[PDB]
Paper text:
Colibactin, a DNA cross-linking agent produced by gut bacteria, is implicated in colorectal cancer. Its biosynthesis uses a prodrug resistance mechanism: a non-toxic precursor assembled in the cytoplasm is activated after export to the periplasm.
Crystal-packing interactions suggest that ClbP forms a dimer, and we confirmed this same dimeric species in solution using single-particle cryogenic electron microscopy (cryo-EM). To directly probe the oligomeric state of detergent-solubilized ClbP, we determined its structure by single-particle cryo-EM. The two-dimensional (2D) class averages derived from this analysis are consistent with the head-to-head dimer observed in the crystal lattice, and none suggests the presence of a monomeric species. The resulting dimeric ClbP structure is nearly identical to the crystallographic dimer (RMSD of 0.830 Å over 904 residues), except for a ~5° bend of each TMD toward the dimer axis. In the dimer, the two periplasmic domains form a canopy over the cell membrane under which the active sites face each other. We discovered that ClbP forms a dimer that may promote the simultaneous activation of the two colibactin warheads, further supporting the proposed pseudodimeric structure of precolibactin.
Author numbering:
A (entry chain B), B (entry chain A): 39 to 162, 165 to 416, 433 to 495
């Protein structure tokens, strides 16, 4: 290890307050490992190379590579209309049915809206039923939008074109040919040996969090792997002498950036079949994924054969910039200050605001007691009856299809205290107002 | 003109609601012009090629080129300590004096905090006095932060090293050798023939806005130019065959991206001496600038000898990316949907909220009048006395050195109505509460 790099790792881990962090750094054959923390705080399970982490959205790299393999063998083509493989699919743009090529989903130019993540994330029907009659945000091929639901359609395409369940396709095409020992696409809700227990921030400290793994979302997330397996993954991507010819050509095509999309002035990030492609001081080929209880980012710089990977036990934006920070250290020897984590900021904001609301409630209760001393129902509870519905419908008004389920799952666990905090404050305040009117 | 491109221009103009828009598009020698709108709504002054616009932050390209010319002649070096040219300068990091090279200011690695724009934007002494004992946000050379005030220090460096006022240095070095007919760096507040009157959004429509041009801020903004002048400017950055050798080599060095700064995962935008450098489908070399009452963004793609130059009569984020939309059209023939302009969004939000506050005030006044009809001072005005100070100090609490002057200058003119709206609402509400207590 480089002591400075290990200090970087520990600093980022402590600032993100994640229970465990696993980082591997490859430099043109030379490798370094950074395996730290506890895979489970509830039993102080020491974190180790053998523990399994959820890859999050990096799963899309595996799905993209599988689709590129299928394309190389000629079983599937980029220009194929999706109806050829998902006849049940119907998608609307301005109320008009829209034909989408497999390439449109492959490069996130399908126009599916981000709120679709909430509906496919539902454990619950194939992808067609969960996307039946969905209304697109934009025309196919006219824009780039990282709607995470896109690669589930690619999962259905893989399943139908190949005639097997996604897990078997993964095992046959990627895990076994690459010699990977533990990487697996779960068959939905499943138990795996020595999996690190997922954690999510709540009230300033990690909270053990687990939710069912939607069967239909695995082709875009929830692929499980170990750090040694991801080292083999990085090695397979960086250098390819031993690989089969079909696999090598599929990887070569996998990095072809989708140039035919409008690009904003300050972003110009190209997206290949799974990988962000950035030409600035690169090619800096990378992705990044935060699951509700896991986060992971991988970065490849093949021109210098540098490969980074950060698998973490908890969702936090800091371990999505962690691979960029490590690459910056390797390139320069300097790294930026830790970015303000959105999850941490939101959790601290809710701590402050719910504590303030409870203090407000205590103050109003004290004033009510004082007025009762100075003096010595359904009508009041109606106000909570309205506030409950108002808050229940509010997220759906702000965004279409945004269920409170999504907010509870993705946001910090303290988010729930805001609805109940507001409802309790309204309860006590309205009741005391009615009492004062009676008094 | 390409009719589709002209439609793009008109669409962006109408959505941004700018009084006037001037765009020139050069394609490997072939050129197109788009001169539209009125340079002044107060007199319907038809916008024309001869009208002068403020270049905003694309001025930094001129100052950067001047510094690079001085560097080529050997009068100045990148590694020179700033104290050599500004002995009056003192800057602190964690309370410790910090030595800054001229390169630090040239590539925005100085650590000055963006709020120094408010102090230098103040008409108000040299740059040293206005930056005397300033506290840096980060160590020199350790980070990239687009503190717009950086190039004013470079203006002082130019003046001291060259021994002339900045305007004369510009005229001698850039305007005259390049044959530019009207581009001039103003000597502070100055009157120029056929300048387009500045405009800023207010209550949903443009408002004629003019503020003094701080003399000390000219080396980083407020340089004036015409569209033919910017066409010559583009033809000088490209097609360098006819230029002097020293000027050619200065331009060659001017695009040298500062690689020694940490780069975020999703940005990786390199900054040369005035120009953002992007390798994605490029080199895409471009700056972009919004003044309080002007906006303009230039974009070059030398490998294909393309370059847009959009100058505008009004500040709006859309025309700060209309030289990226045009590149997208040229490259692909497709362009993205108009981004939500921050100025437009803020102005509409303040329209809604101040109208709601006035409606609230009317309702409370109506209830007070009813209670007066239901009935047949300094004590109440004290509440406004507190609210006034609370709102006055509030921006300074949120950010260091953020004067209400800055908010009024940069924000839409409706922003002032929020202080007064809140103060009037508190006035009427507290007065009616006191009256009810008396009643």
């Amino acid at each position: 290890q480089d002591e400075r790099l290990s200090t970087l790792i520990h600093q980022r881990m402590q600032e993100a307050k994640v229970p465990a962090l696993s980082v591997s750094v490859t430099i043109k054959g030379v490798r370094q490992r950074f395996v730290y923390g506890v895979a489970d705080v509830a039993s102080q399970k020491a974190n180790t190379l053998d523990t399994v982490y959820e890859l999050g959205s990096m799963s899309k790299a595996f799905t993209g590579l599988v689709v590129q393999i299928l394309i190389q063998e000629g079983r599937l083509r980029q220009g194929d209309d999706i109806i050829t493989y998902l006849p049940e699919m119907r998608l609307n743009y301005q109320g008009k049915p829209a034909s989408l090529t497999v390439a449109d989903f492959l490069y996130h130019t399908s126009g599916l809206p981000f709120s679709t993540l909430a509906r496919l994330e539902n454990p619950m029907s194939a992808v067609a039923q969960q996307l039946r009659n969905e209304n697109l945000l934009f025309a196919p091929g006219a824009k780039f939008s990282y709607a995470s639901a896109n690669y589930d359609v690619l999962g259905a395409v893989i399943e139908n074109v190949t005639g097997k369940t996604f897990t078997e396709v993964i095992a046959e095409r990627l895990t076994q040919p690459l010699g990977m020992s533990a990487t697996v696409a779960v068959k939905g809700d499943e138990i795996i040996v020595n999996k690190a227990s997922g954690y999510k921030l709540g009230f300033g400290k990690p909270v053990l969090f687990h939710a069912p793994l939607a069967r239909n979302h695995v082709p875009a997330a929830y692929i499980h792997s170990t750090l040694p397996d991801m080292e083999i993954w990085i090695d397979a991507w960086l250098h390819r002498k031993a690989l089969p010819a079909t696999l090598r050509e599929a990887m070569s095509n996998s990095w072809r950036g989708n140039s035919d999309v409008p690009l904003a002035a300050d972003n110009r990030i190209l997206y290949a079949s799974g990988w962000f492609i950035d030409q600035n001081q690169g090619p800096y080929i990378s992705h990044g994924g935060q699951n509700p209880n896991f986060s992971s980012c991988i970065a490849l710089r093949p021109d210098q054969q540098i490969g980074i990977v950060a698998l973490a036990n908890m969702n936090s934006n800091l371990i999505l910039q962690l691979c960029a920070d490590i690459d910056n250290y390797l390139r320069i020897g300097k790294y930026a200050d830790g970015a303000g984590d959105a999850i941490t900021a939101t959790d601290t904001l809710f701590v402050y605001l719910t504590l303030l609301l409870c203090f407000w409630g205590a103050v109003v209760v004290v004033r009510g007691a004082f007025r009762v001393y100075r003096a010595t129902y359904i009508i009041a509870l109606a106000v909570p009856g309205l506030v409950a519905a108002m808050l229940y419908v509010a997220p759906g008004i702000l965004s279409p299809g945004l269920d409170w389920r999504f907010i509870l799952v993705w946001g910090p666990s303290s988010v729930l205290a805001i609805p109940f905090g507001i409802i309790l404050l309204a309860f006590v305040l309205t009741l005391n107002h009615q009492i004062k009117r009676i008094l």
